[PDB]
Amino acid sequence: EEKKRLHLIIADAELETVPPEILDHPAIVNYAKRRKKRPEKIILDSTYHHAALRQLEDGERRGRPDIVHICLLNALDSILNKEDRLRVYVHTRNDYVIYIKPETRLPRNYNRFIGLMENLFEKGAVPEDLELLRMEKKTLNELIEEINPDVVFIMHEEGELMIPKNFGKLLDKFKKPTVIVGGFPHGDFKSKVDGVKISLYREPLMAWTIVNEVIVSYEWEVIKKF
Template sequence: MLHLVIAEAELELAPRSILDHPAIVNHAKRRGKRPEEIILDATYHHSALKKLEDGDRRGRPDIVHICLLNALESIANKEGLLRVYVHTRNDEVIYIKPETRIPRNYNRFVGLMESLFQNRAVPKNLELLRMEEKSLRELIDEISPDEVFVMHEEGEPTKPADFGRTLASIENPVVIVGGFPHGDFRSKILGKKISLYKAPLMAWTVMNEIIINFEHWVP
């Protein structure tokens, strides 16, 4: 079983410190929500992000959206060989059942995430998505993997096919992919660092390479 963790994902509700910012207030009003109920989104809240620490990398739910669409529709997931988790910058972990169908429409996805932050599980009766307060280290300890790999541009250069073969040879590997647009992990991440290409790649590209090459080597 391959465990993929989208770590330090820039997925969060609008922070309290900017709830009164016009960009947040107006966007919430247009959507018929209170400011504290909406997901921070750089597309709509760019001017408000300037007032936040790390504002240049925050408000990127689109990264999680694309990653989940690709992972959950993969052959590995359909064959029961994959588990995907989202760890947020605020140490929340989203557990995702393999049968979950993520909305293809981005606005519907954002609405789903807002409901998840509010209710901690959606839908309530099935809990296809469930959120818990948990650090990345606690999640890894819970999974109890045989080996942990961290995708990093300064990691050991490795051909995607070779990495896929390595993952397929390990019974319970964890691969950590950064869920942010640029920069480095904010905290120390334990695991063997791996780089699949000579230049930085977007998170969803990295995930696609990992999953497809893992599938190639699975018996």
């Protein structure tokens, strides 16, 4: 744990269980009933729960765990991860952090991945001995503190523009660079932290695109074989 790795935080993620406010909205009960599960245990998924988000704060961007799924399948199956050059983290829109042991194989199927998330929030670490996934109350600065990185990059549409190629060459110049990708469909970050704001393109991109640009550009810089 002295080699150059990328610490990659999927921040302000729209990954949460059903909000208390709407546990008794019809759509939440009818869904909870069909799925034979206590509503407060269920992961909020706008695709099913839209009719219950109409009146909720930030309701239109919330309950998009899909974004996380695709970002993790991207990160964890990366060559970069296979070479032991990536720690990936998830910080949620409710200031919970998820630590992810590199060797973790996420479910390829979305609905198994959701099943896993429901577990993780219930038990707090899964599975029981291994704790490949572990979750606890934590702000993003508290998390950044733990990492103790020598640079922080905030992937943001309004940042200093870079060719992806070049960002990679930049990340290689540090020992423990953190990069923060928003885990949310649209809008600005909620957590404001210190960090360098970087745009990799002009028009806005989705989290996973950002993830894949960032990881590959480092890969060809940090992986010596390349």
